[PDB]
Design a protein around this nucleic acid. Structure first.
Ligand code: MG
Ligand code: MG
Ligand code: MG
Ligand code: MG
Ligand code: MG
Ligand code: MG
Ligand code: MG
Ligand code: MG
Ligand code: MG
Ligand code: MG
Ligand code: MG
Ligand code: MG
Ligand code: MG
Ligand code: MG
Ligand code: MG
Ligand code: MG
Ligand code: MG
Ligand code: MG
Ligand code: MG
Ligand code: MG
Ligand code: MG
Lengths: 260, 243, 173, 185, 134
RNA sequence: AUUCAUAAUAACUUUUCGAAUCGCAUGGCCUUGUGCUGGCGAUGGUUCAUUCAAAUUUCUGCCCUAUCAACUUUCGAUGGUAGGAUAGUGGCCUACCAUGGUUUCAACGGGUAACGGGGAAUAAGGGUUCGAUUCCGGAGAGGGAGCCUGAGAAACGGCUACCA
RNA sequence: AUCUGGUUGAUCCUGCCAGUAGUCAUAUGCUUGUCUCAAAGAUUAAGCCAUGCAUGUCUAAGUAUAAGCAAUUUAUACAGUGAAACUGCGAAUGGCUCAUUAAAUCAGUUAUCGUUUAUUUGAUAGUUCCUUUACUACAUGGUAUAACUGUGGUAAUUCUAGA
């Protein structure tokens, strides 16, 4: 066409929003922002579909317009604001704190968070580089640019960020045997330890990962996102702990939680 | 397709509703307790012209009505509904036959039905099925539409070309039937179109000899046309020759 | 009806492509241009009306013209425009010299007055103060950050020289 | 621009149209159970068929393969909840052997006549579509309800119905009014 | 022999919209389904709010009868109800008034005619009255 | 993986940006000048990054026809150098050089009552046949061509011309 | 995972014609009570179109002397509301159709160390009159304009001229 599109048809929306397919004909096209369209969750979706806090769309606008909803410490008032991975969401009138982290089944999940964990945030470092007047900086996956980091921090490292000041607390290096959330791809929503990184030059690096049930899988480096240490994560994982079960296992677990 | 279109324009130029047109519509109610003047009143009150209605009530039965909405020259004819053969004579010259239908009274098996059939046999151009008495039934539409549809299935029987009996009570259908009468091209009836015919507006007489003279007839020619040498028939008068 | 246009040196009519800032046209839509007939600049026998201005008054009075006089609808709105209309000093407050109008209704007679623009008030002084403030404050804060970083860097290089000292003593031993 | 509302046929017309044997078989089948179209039979034949397909497609795969296990067990326990497949035949190889009558025997229509709330099967028809016959707290008016097993022990008359309780119907109080008014006179 | 029982399920306390929302079960045997008005009345006494601070909608009477589900919100004051609710609901509750504005057709037509007028138009009125007197 | 990021020298420039803007609160501190300070947020603004894009782009894949066997290059066909143009690579164009490039593994031409795909119908399987049409991509707005505005249009519920 | 009738005096074949079933595929005939649901000028003429509508937009927070509305309770700069118009943004999305188009489009997959990017988000800015503390608005320069007042033109337009 000619310019950027401004709509999003219902069926063409990213599936893991779980929008029903007779509600309408369109679906909340995420605004421009911190995260990629395909892999972000517009606040309206988070608010009306996943918290049930509002029934319509205008109820959601109504909510948003009282400066109620914060995202990463700050107040956003865009129905289609693109809150994606690892972002903190604050509802002060309920005194609740949310974190957008992936469920085992590859979709976004509600996750309650203490005030002491809401303060900070992780960020995969997508690129370090040297800017004007020779001042070195990183660019972290949520789009944040941070100046004067510690020289030990190269690509793929995770960074802890005080949401308040926007400064770097500490960080984590990308070495064999760390804890890791896998963000894009099929194994998205899993957690495990990185066995070894496979290096393919001019192509996509892979990573072998072994979870807590000592089962293994492989994903591109592109989707590996470092959390912390062996059983010492820097954020609180959801229930499921990024441990994916065969449909048999889940069938059994469900039928075994029925005794009335 | 360009040829087709040209030919179609040529065949649709007989009704240039500004100077050279004469669309004959004949109004035929099929029910005793029904008024044709009323049916016309509806069709021309939906043209928003109160004057052309008021000027006709006084003294007339044949009218030259020009509609400006669609730019068309209609000629309306209402028959002497006491004379059967006058009804037949009326319709058999028409380009259009409107049928009035009653919501109250069922059409007569011995009279109105025979109007239908006989018109149908002698020849009919384009016909339409229209109602006026529909408001006379229950005020709620739920019951009126019943009558309408039963009438539609009665009317479909003799005239399968149509499936919609139009209701003049509603402004839409009336505007639509008027629309059709104006725009839609009327089909051809073989025998009448191949020998020509003039409907007379003004008939004057000039004395030439003490025992015979010259009937003068001012009217528009439709069909094949007339030649000075050929004879002319005039119904219930006989065959005469042209001067 | 077609209006005359200054420029077109011709005693007739000619179609032009008119644009934004010209006569005889008002652009309906942004950047739109249009082809219109326009009348030449040179007066002829076709003109229904000629539009004339008076530059030098004559000996005799003109009834509908010179005899009557119409007041200018609107007085100044900007502070220094006012200051020019009443020839006031820099130190004269403009507040008082502002033209008002006396509107009438019912049994009340109320008076309106134009808002003064570009008017120096405590507010704008505050905002400017705020600008110098945030600019300088920001600059000093930045210098602080680069200082702390340079401190870190310099300490790390010295740590690196100590490590290489240990490695040189281990390689020599 | 909506989503396109999906939909599907339900039955399937026989291949040979006039086949004196199939004709009869069908008629006796409609007779045992009071069906009105042959179509009612076809619908069953068709569901049956889809099950026999799922069946085979599982059968050709290795035992102790995740898929045959999962979908096998599912298909089985599904067939069991409606009591089409008996408790003891709980293995795929029987679900093939299944025939039409095994399905035709779980209709609400049927179970109403086999729980003796009706005199004949046709009576059961009428009684169902007449909004008389409830399954627990629900009325049901479709002759093809397909009674699950845990819902067998609940079927009774409707708390709405004349027989279930409530007041007599329109005919009843019509004749009550007729006799009472004829005697008052 | 009726016994209208009103149950409230899946209840949530929503401070964001200063209200509590929930599902409404209604068991109404022998009863030909319960009016909305009545429902508001009976819910008010329960959640201790004004009859106008309660809203109920979407009620669907089950097959066969004697039950129906709907949805219901109830605000912390009637002020907030008045400012958060959709207007047509507040018309169902008389708590606001239907505003007589002409047909859609009409409105659009007026907009479009007015497009063809540059400026206030009293100019054009003086001019046309003048050219008509002429 | 770079003549990358970045820094430095020398100059250059019809000198780009470096807040004359708005709404709310109105407080501190003194030499008492109505002096200097002072919260929150809106809009704007340069560069870098990000998001939304866009444009090009690599590999592999298209129905019928030999009663289409040679086709491409004056007029770009294939490549080199240099330039010009473009947001940018690039025969995209312009000069100047070469004499190449495709082809029975079916080019080129002709046909299509041909938009492409996700998909649909039917078959045990293998297939055969549909896919104008609800999602994606493309193309057009009576037919051609040209252009303003703008981040984005060769736009037609914008403009200009010719043809109908 | 099926076939049956037709060449002969009779027979077995090759072989087609005929029959049979499907189409969530069009048309048409005859017929038509109820629930849910749904497509619908694609096929031929990307043929032609009357009328009506489909794109406009203002918040505590760009510009109000409407000679508008509200008067009223502090406002003699303004201060409530606000047509009009200037500014800003949008009109490049959407919706439609399938005419063109056969390595073209498109699918999958790459690349940009080969580029542009309104917007969003995050960072980002002491240097910008003459001399060296003396001289020139920074408590803040300048100009047009619209709407409006009034004068007009023409059969006519979402035409506009002069002051
Ligand atoms: Mg589009
Ligand atoms: Mg992937
Ligand atoms: Mg050349
Ligand atoms: Mg070059
Ligand atoms: Mg085609
Ligand atoms: Mg086969
Ligand atoms: Mg298609
Ligand atoms: Mg086609
Ligand atoms: Mg499309
Ligand atoms: Mg286009
Ligand atoms: Mg057309
Ligand atoms: Mg724009
Ligand atoms: Mg165009
Ligand atoms: Mg159009
Ligand atoms: Mg368009
Ligand atoms: Mg055949
Ligand atoms: Mg067509
Ligand atoms: Mg269509
Ligand atoms: Mg305001
Ligand atoms: Mg920015
Ligand atoms: Mg000047």
């Amino acid at each position: 066409a000619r310019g950027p599109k401004k709509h999003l048809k219902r069926l063409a929306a990213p599936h893991h929003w779980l929008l029903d397919k007779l509600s309408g004909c369109y679906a909340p096209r995420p605004s421009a922002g911190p995260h990629k369209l395909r892999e972000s969750l517009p606040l309206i979706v988070f608010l009306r579909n996943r918290l049930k806090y509002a029934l319509n769309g205008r109820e959601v606008k109504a909510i948003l317009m009282q400066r109620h909803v914060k995202v990463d410490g700050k107040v956003r008032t865009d129905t289609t604001y693109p809150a994606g991975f690892m972002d903190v969401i604050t509802l002060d009138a309920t005194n609740e704190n949310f974190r957008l982290v992936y469920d085992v089944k590859g979709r976004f999940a509600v996750h309650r968070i203490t005030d002491e964990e809401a303060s900070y945030k992780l960020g995969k470092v997508k690129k370090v580089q040297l800017g004007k007047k020779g001042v070195p900086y990183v660019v972290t996956h949520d789009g944040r640019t941070i100046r004067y980091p510690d020289p030990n921090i190269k690509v793929n490292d995770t960074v802890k960020i005080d949401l308040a000041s926007g400064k770097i607390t500490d960080f984590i290096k990308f070495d064999a045997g760390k804890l890791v959330y896998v963000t894009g791809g099929r194994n998205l929503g899993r957690i495990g330890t990185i066995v070894h990184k496979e290096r393919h030059d001019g192509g996509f690096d892979l990573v072998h990962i072994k979870d807590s049930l000592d089962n293994t899988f492989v994903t591109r480096l592109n989707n590996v996102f470092v959390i912390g240490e062996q059983g010492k994560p820097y954020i609180s994982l959801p229930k499921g702990k990024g441990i994916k079960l065969s449909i048999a296992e889940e069938r059994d677990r469900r039928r075994a939680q029925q005794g009335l | 397709r360009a040829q087709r279109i040209l030919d179609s324009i040529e065949n649709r130029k007989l009704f240039e509703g500004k100077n050279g047109a004469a669309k004959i519509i004949t109004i035929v109610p099929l029910v005793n307790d029904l008024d044709p003047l009323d049916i016309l009143y509806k069709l021309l009150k939906c043209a928003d012209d109160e004057g052309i209605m008021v000027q006709e009530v006084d003294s007339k039965r044949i009218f030259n009505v020009h509609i400006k909405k669609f730019k068309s020259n209609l000629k309306i004819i209402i028959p002497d509904m006491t004379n059967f053969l006058n009804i037949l004579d009326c319709a058999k010259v028409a380009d259009f036959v409107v049928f009035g239908l009653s919501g109250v009274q069922e059409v007569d098996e011995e009279f109105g039905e025979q109007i239908i059939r006989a018109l149908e046999l002698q020849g009919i151009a384009s016909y339409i099925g229209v109602i006026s008495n529909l408001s006379a039934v229950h005020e709620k539409e739920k019951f009126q539409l019943d009558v309408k549809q039963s009438l539609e299935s009665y009317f479909k029987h003799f005239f399968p070309s149509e499936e919609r009996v139009y209701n003049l009570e509603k402004n839409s259908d009336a505007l639509n039937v008027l629309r059709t009468l104006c725009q839609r091209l009327p089909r051809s009836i073989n025998w009448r179109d191949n020998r020509g015919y003039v409907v007379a507006d003004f008939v004057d007489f000039v004395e030439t000899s003490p025992d015979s003279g010259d009937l003068v007839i001012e009217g528009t020619v439709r069909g094949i046309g007339f030649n000075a040498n050929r004879l002319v028939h005039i119904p219930d008068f006989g065959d005469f020759q042209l001067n | 009806g077609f209006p005359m246009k200054q420029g077109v040196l011709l005693p007739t009519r000619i179609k032009l492509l008119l644009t934004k800032n010209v006569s005889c046209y008002r652009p309906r839509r942004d950047g739109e241009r249009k082809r219109k007939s326009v009348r030449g600049a040179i007066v002829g026998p076709d003109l229904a009306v000629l539009a004339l201005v008076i530059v030098k008054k004559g000996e005799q009075e003109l009834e509908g013209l010179t005899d009557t006089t119409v007041p200018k609808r609107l007085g100044p709105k900007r502070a220094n425009n006012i200051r020019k209309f009443f020839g006031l000093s820099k130190e004269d407050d403009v507040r008082d010299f502002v033209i008002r109008r006396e509107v009438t209704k019912g049994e009340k007679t109320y008076t309106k007055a134009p808002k003064i623009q570009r008017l120096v008030t405590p507010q704008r002084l505050q905002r400017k103060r705020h600008q110098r403030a945030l600019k300088v404050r920001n600059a000093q804060a930045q210098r602080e950050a680069a200082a702390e970083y340079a401190q870190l860097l310099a300490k790390r290089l010295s740590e690196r020289k100590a490590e290489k000292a240990e490695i040189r003593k281990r390689r020599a031993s | 621009p909506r989503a396109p509302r999906t939909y599907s046929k339900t039955y399937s017309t026989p291949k040979r149209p006039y086949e004196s044997s199939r004709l009869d078989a069908e008629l006796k089948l409609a007779g045992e159970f009071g069906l009105k179209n042959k179509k009612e039979i076809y619908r069953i034949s068709f569901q049956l068929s889809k099950i026999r397909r799922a069946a085979r497609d599982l059968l050709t795969r290795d035992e102790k393969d995740p898929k045959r296990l999962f979908e096998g067990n599912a298909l089985i326990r599904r067939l069991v909840r409606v009591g089409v497949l008996s408790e003891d035949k709980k293995k795929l190889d029987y679900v093939l052997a299944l025939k039409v009558e095994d399905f035709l025997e779980r209709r609400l229509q049927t179970q109403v006549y086999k729980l003796g709330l009706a005199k004949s099967v046709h009576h059961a028809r009428v009684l169902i579509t007449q909004r008389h016959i409830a399954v627990g707290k629900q009325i049901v008016n479709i002759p093809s309800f397909m009674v699950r097993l845990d819902s067998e022990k609940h079927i009774d008359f409707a708390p709405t119905s004349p027989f279930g309780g409530a007041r007599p119907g329109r005919v009843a109080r019509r004749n009550a009014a007729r006799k009472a008014e004829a005697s008052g006179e | 022999s009726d016994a209208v029982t009103i149950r409230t399920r899946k209840v949530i306390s929503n401070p964001l919209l200063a209200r509590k929302q929930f599902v409404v079960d209604v068991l109404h045997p022998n009863r030909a389904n319960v009016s909305k008005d009545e429902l508001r009345e009976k819910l008010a006494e329960v959640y201790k709010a004004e009859k106008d601070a309660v809203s109920v909608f979407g009620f669907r009477t089950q097959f066969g009868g004697g039950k129906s589900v709907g949805f219901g919100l109830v605000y912390n004051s009637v002020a907030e109800a008045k400012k958060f609710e959709p207007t047509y609901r507040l018309v169902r509750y008389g708590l606001a008034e239907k505003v007589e504005k002409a047909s859609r057709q009409q409105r659009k037509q007026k907009k479009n005619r007015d497009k063809k007028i540059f400026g206030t138009g009293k100019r054009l009125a003086k001019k046309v009255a003048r050219r008509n007197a002429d």
